[PDB]
């Protein structure tokens, strides 16, 4: 929720690109999707987030014993600009009634 | 099948001429850069409109 208001202070003030805080990283593909719905699974979140790129490999944290999701996934794309696009875009999204969170 | 020749009508030329005369007469005070604006405006006013027929 705090993200979207950082993108609004970044757009409103005329940040103009490379000083963007996605340049904070430059080293990292893997993204963090928290607040995910428990019914979701690999193939699903792959099908939704391959929109903005091609996701190479994602490890979704699912509790070892019960074998169900703890509610979040660390994902890895083939492209960084896909990550920048995904954090800056896909965030604040409704899924099954609950708004997911994303960040680097 | 045919050819149409264009020519700029008399009354039009008369209007333009009265427009230049308007620029000279109505400005005794106004700045010299201002007059040139008046000229340019009138002149493109003629040329963009008539174009081919002018030549």
């Amino acid at each position: 929720k705090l993200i979207n208001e950082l993108n609004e202070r970044e757009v409103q003030l005329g940040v103009a690109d490379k000083v963007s805080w996605h340049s904070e990283y430059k080293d990292s593909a893997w993204i963090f999707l928290g607040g995910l719905p428990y019914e979701l699974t690999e193939g699903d979140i792959i099908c939704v987030f391959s929109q903005y790129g091609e996701i190479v490999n994602i490890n979704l944290v699912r509790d070892k014993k019960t074998g169900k999701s703890k509610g979040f996934c660390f994902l890895c794309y083939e492209d960084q600009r896909s990550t920048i696009l995904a954090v800056d875009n896909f965030n604040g999204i409704k899924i099954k009634g609950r708004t997911i969170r994303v960040d680097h | 099948t045919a050819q149409c020749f264009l020519r700029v009508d008399d009354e039009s030329m008369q209007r333009f001429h009265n427009r230049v005369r308007q620029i000279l007469m109505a400005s005794g005070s106004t700045t010299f850069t201002k007059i040139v604006n008046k000229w340019n405006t009138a002149l493109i006013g003629l040329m963009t409109y008539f174009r081919e027929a002018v030549v």
Partner: protein, 41 residues
């Protein structure tokens, strides 16, 4: 469920470039200048 529409229609990058309405350019006043669309250098 895809989100579908008839035809395609148009993209976005352009679909909102130039001002709006605005109207021509004054009654046609001499004082205006405005002949050139972009600066010299």
């Amino acid at each position: 469920n895809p989100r579908t529409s008839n035809e395609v229609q148009y993209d976005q990058r352009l679909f909102n470039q130039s001002k709006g309405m605005d109207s021509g350019f004054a009654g046609g006043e001499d004082e205006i200048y405005n002949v050139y669309d972009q600066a010299w250098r």
